[PDB]
Design an enzyme around this catalytic site. Structure first.
Site, PDB file in Angstrom:
ATOM      1  N   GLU A  35     -47.703   4.668  69.567  1.00 33.54           N
ATOM      2  CA  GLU A  35     -46.683   5.013  68.579  1.00 33.54           C
ATOM      3  C   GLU A  35     -46.430   3.858  67.605  1.00 33.54           C
ATOM      4  O   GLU A  35     -46.366   4.069  66.391  1.00 33.54           O
ATOM      5  CB  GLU A  35     -45.371   5.409  69.257  1.00 33.54           C
ATOM      6  N   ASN A  46     -42.432  10.967  57.787  1.00 32.98           N
ATOM      7  CA  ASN A  46     -43.090  12.234  58.074  1.00 32.98           C
ATOM      8  C   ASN A  46     -43.131  13.121  56.850  1.00 32.98           C
ATOM      9  O   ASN A  46     -42.370  12.920  55.898  1.00 32.98           O
ATOM     10  CB  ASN A  46     -42.382  12.951  59.216  1.00 32.98           C
ATOM     11  N   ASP A  48     -42.078  15.927  56.223  1.00 36.98           N
ATOM     12  CA  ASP A  48     -40.837  16.644  55.941  1.00 36.98           C
ATOM     13  C   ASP A  48     -39.693  15.747  55.470  1.00 36.98           C
ATOM     14  O   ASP A  48     -38.583  16.221  55.221  1.00 36.98           O
ATOM     15  CB  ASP A  48     -40.395  17.405  57.178  1.00 36.98           C
ATOM     16  N   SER A  50     -38.275  13.210  57.162  1.00 40.04           N
ATOM     17  CA  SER A  50     -37.694  12.460  58.263  1.00 40.04           C
ATOM     18  C   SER A  50     -38.531  11.207  58.459  1.00 40.04           C
ATOM     19  O   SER A  50     -39.634  11.096  57.934  1.00 40.04           O
ATOM     20  CB  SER A  50     -37.677  13.292  59.542  1.00 40.04           C
ATOM     21  N   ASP A  52     -39.712   8.170  61.524  1.00 34.60           N
ATOM     22  CA  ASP A  52     -39.812   7.736  62.911  1.00 34.60           C
ATOM     23  C   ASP A  52     -39.478   6.260  62.992  1.00 34.60           C
ATOM     24  O   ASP A  52     -39.979   5.483  62.189  1.00 34.60           O
ATOM     25  CB  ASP A  52     -41.219   7.946  63.459  1.00 34.60           C
ATOM     26  N   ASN A  59     -37.510  10.064  66.046  1.00 35.49           N
ATOM     27  CA  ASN A  59     -37.429  10.805  64.782  1.00 35.49           C
ATOM     28  C   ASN A  59     -36.038  11.106  64.259  1.00 35.49           C
ATOM     29  O   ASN A  59     -35.265  11.633  64.969  1.00 35.49           O
ATOM     30  CB  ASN A  59     -38.172  12.140  64.945  1.00 35.49           C
ATOM     31  N   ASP A 101     -35.170  16.666  77.875  1.00 36.71           N
ATOM     32  CA  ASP A 101     -34.691  17.726  76.968  1.00 36.71           C
ATOM     33  C   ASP A 101     -35.407  19.083  76.975  1.00 36.71           C
ATOM     34  O   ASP A 101     -34.851  20.083  76.509  1.00 36.71           O
ATOM     35  CB  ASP A 101     -34.698  17.201  75.517  1.00 36.71           C
TER      36      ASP A 101
END
Ligand SMILES: [Cl-]
Length: 129
Positions: A35, A46, A48, A50, A52, A59, A101
């Site tokens: 990562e 990203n 969209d 957003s 990280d 995110n 989650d």
């Protein structure tokens, strides 16, 4: 900060990640490697809009607030910049919420694509834990 491999393994170990929700330590170190290359200051945008953040590329779409991801959530209730500290505590605490989650460590694309189904023990070889 750019962590050494065993330095990060030891840090993740004392923060309680070894076998957390059944994920051995090597999975967490493998995830961080691919990562962020162990760099706490890593950020990536990203498609969209957003972003990280940090050692585990958490995110802004869901988990932290950066004030520039319209319509997003802040499920870890923390500013995204807090996830860039040399101290990994904030990232680990948020990671524990993420992994509990639903799809577990599949929430980290690099874990799913590069760690899952491989021998990850090698990532903690030789480390003082
Ligand atoms: Cl290293």
């Amino acid at each position: 900060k750019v962590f050494g491999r065993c330095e990060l393994a030891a840090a993740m170990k004392r923060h309680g990640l070894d076998n957390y929700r059944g994920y051995s330590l090597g999975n967490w170190v493998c995830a961080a490697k691919f990562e962020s290359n162990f760099n706490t200051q890593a950020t990536n945008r990203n498609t969209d809009g957003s972003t990280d953040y940090g050692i585990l590329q958490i995110n802004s779409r869901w988990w932290c607030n950066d004030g520039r991801t319209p319509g997003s959530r802040n499920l870890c209730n923390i500013p995204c910049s807090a996830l860039l500290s040399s101290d990994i505590t904030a990232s680990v605490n948020c990671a524990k919420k993420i992994v509990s989650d639903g799809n577990g460590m599949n929430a980290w694309v690099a874990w799913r694509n590069r760690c899952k189904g491989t021998d990850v023990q090698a990532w903690i070889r030789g480390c003082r834990l």
